[PDB]
């Protein structure tokens, strides 16, 4: 079965061209005579431009194929203009005209000058790799993809040794070892079918690693989670039910080790955990299961009276990094409670506890979020004392942060 037809250009386009040139009152047989001649020349060239596509070993007819197909038929590749003498440009392609259907048809002559030129790409180089090693294709990134019998483990001993080396490197005794092991996790294609043992090693580790608050052990495990996530080959949402309560524990937990000093890292432990938490709510999303569940736990962490301030700071960070609208709809009705908590830490003399440090970190983070939440939905008018209607927390310094954001927008 082949219902192949002969499609020509419409004749009602050929009369428009003729009467817009000075040739009026053309007959239909005169006009049909134009549209079978030019539709043959389009068919003659597109069949002849398909010879250059095949010879160049491409499957896409580029714009230069018609330039050589025209030159082959002794017609100038020039499309915009036609030179009767032909001496200024003799069968020289000018690369066509960059024109569109949805174009503006008028531009300003200094708009084209002030735009940045595109980056010239890298030159052609010759790299060698292996398609086949004695018959077997390697999984390198240059390649696409009555007694019952004594059973064998589903991992090989090379794979089991690889798992042991990667896990003993990912506990961060040496930093270059970690970084390679993290890149190895980030791009091994065959890291599926080992992923249960990695997820179990992460989950089990954080839970017996918060019994004594060992910050590096945790910072290395969170980097292992981040290296597990950006791997494109492996299927993760079968294992995310173990991954998510591990990161929530890094963010919402108390620190058993020295309270101050590494709290700077503790903020990053809560910074790395809140980053991977909102990346996990970005992926793996179905209706009303993952993002709303962690949002509900973060909000009941917040509205809980008389919290640990480490847990308070971590939950504050976690609710803060959830995106544009989440701080637009959630952080709004709670400024008075935040201010009252800050006032209590300030009044009580107790300085040797961690309450004061927790309060300062929470207030700074909340004030930065409130700044763009404001820069985003209102003009920057009355930036001096109008914020005193919102208990005067960040005030003019918040206004200065908004001004810095406006300067960054101007630079963009």
């Amino acid at each position: 079965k082949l219902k192949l037809s002969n499609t020509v250009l419409p004749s009602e386009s050929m009369k428009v061209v003729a009467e817009s040139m000075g040739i009026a009152q053309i007959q239909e047989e005169t006009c049909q005579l134009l549209t079978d001649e030019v539709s043959y020349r389009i068919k003659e060239i597109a069949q002849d431009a398909l010879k250059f596509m095949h010879m160049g070993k491409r499957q896409k007819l580029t714009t230069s194929d018609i330039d050589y197909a025209l030159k082959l038929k002794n017609v100038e590749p020039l499309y915009g203009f036609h030179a009767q003498e032909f001496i200024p440009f003799r069968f020289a392609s000018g690369g066509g005209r960059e024109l569109y259907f949805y174009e503006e048809k008028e531009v300003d002559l200094s708009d084209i000058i002030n735009t940045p030129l595109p980056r010239v790409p890298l030159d052609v180089c010759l790299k060698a790799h292996w398609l086949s090693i004695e018959g077997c294709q390697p999984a390198i990134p240059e390649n696409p993809p009555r007694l019952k019998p004594r059973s064998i483990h589903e991992l090989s001993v090379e794979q089991q040794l690889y798992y042991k080396e990667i896990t003993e490197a990912c506990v961060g005794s040496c930093e270059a070892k970690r970084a390679e092991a993290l890149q190895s996790i980030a791009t091994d294609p065959g890291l599926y079918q080992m992923l249960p043992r990695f997820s179990t090693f992460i989950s089990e580790g954080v839970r017996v690693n918060v019994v004594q608050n060992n910050l590096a052990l945790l910072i290395y495990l969170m980097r292992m989670v981040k290296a597990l996530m950006d791997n494109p080959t492996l299927y993760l949402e079968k294992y995310v039910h173990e991954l998510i309560p591990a990161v929530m524990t890094c963010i919402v937990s108390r620190q058993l080790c020295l309270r101050p000093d590494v709290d700077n890292h503790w903020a990053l432990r809560d910074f790395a955990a809140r980053l991977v938490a909102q990346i996990c709510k970005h992926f793996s999303t179905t209706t009303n299961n993952i993002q709303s569940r962690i949002t509900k736990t973060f909000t009941k962490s917040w509205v809980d009276e008389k919290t640990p301030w480490t847990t308070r700071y971590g939950s504050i960070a976690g609710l803060a990094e959830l995106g544009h609208d989440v701080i637009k709809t959630l952080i709004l009705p709670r400024l008075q409670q935040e201010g009252e908590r800050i006032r209590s830490v300030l009044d009580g003399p107790v300085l040797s506890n961690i309450d004061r440090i927790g309060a300062d970190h929470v207030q700074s983070l909340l004030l930065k979020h409130c700044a763009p939440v404001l820069a985003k939905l209102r003009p920057p008018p009355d930036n001096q004392d109008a914020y005193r209607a919102e208990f005067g927390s960040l005030g003019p310094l918040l206004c200065s942060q908004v001004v810095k954001a406006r300067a960054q927008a101007a630079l963009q």
Partner: peptide
């Protein structure tokens, strides 16, 4: 549609919130 593979993934069928360790001791 309730036989879709996701329904049976244990993130959507497990109260994993209980695991998060708060103030453990």
């Amino acid at each position: 549609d309730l036989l879709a593979d996701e329904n049976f993934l244990m993130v959507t069928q497990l109260h994993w919130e209980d695991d998060i360790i708060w103030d453990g001791e």
